[PDB]
């Protein structure tokens, strides 16, 4: 989670598309999708960002509508964002034990109970908290079973972001359960 402010400067795709749904939160303009293959993942637009600006002009208090009417509307050749990293997700870095476990059990993504003498207990991992990445790879709506198969493939230090379910639950309402599994980009950034 970097600590502050950027400017992202996007560029719409031959089919005038960015590969970003926003959703308003607490009068702040949140990033709900970022579409594999789009201008937003290549800028490394990630679920969670906060969107403070748009072409220099505030989002505060935009509806969800206006942030995407507004985007429609930019003149294409250059659109400034001023993003905000990730403010409601945290990471931990966890070890796993020489049996492959980090000591947590997850329900839908959501983190459900902390073993006791783990890493995740001694890293202080909370429930209640779903997970939006692991070693910086979005996992949202990928399947419980192959959140397990990256973190069985991690080696054994493994970073996870997450966030604070009910917070998870206002971001994610009104984008349909297969759209989050088929079109939240899962891929390892590009260099």
Known sequence: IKQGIREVILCKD???????????????????????????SLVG??????????????????SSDK???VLKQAFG??????????????????????????????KNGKITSIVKDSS????????????????????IGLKDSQIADILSTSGTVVTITIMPAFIFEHIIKRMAPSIMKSLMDHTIPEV
Do not use: Y
């Open 14 to 40: 031959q089919d005038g598309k960015i590969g970003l749904r926003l959703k308003s939160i607490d009068n702040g303009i949140f990033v709900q999708l970022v579409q594999a293959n789009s201008p937003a």
């Open 45 to 62: 637009l990630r679920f969670g960002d906060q969107v403070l600006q748009i072409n220099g002009e505030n989002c505060a208090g935009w």
């Open 67 to 69: 942030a995407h009417k």
């Open 77 to 106: 050749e250059k659109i400034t964002m001023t993003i905000r990293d990730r403010p409601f997700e945290r990471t931990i870095t966890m070890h796993k034990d020489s049996t492959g476990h980090v000591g947590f059990i997850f």
């Open 120 to 139: 995740a207990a001694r890293n202080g991992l909370l429930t209640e908290h779903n997970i939006c990445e692991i070693n910086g790879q979005n996992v």
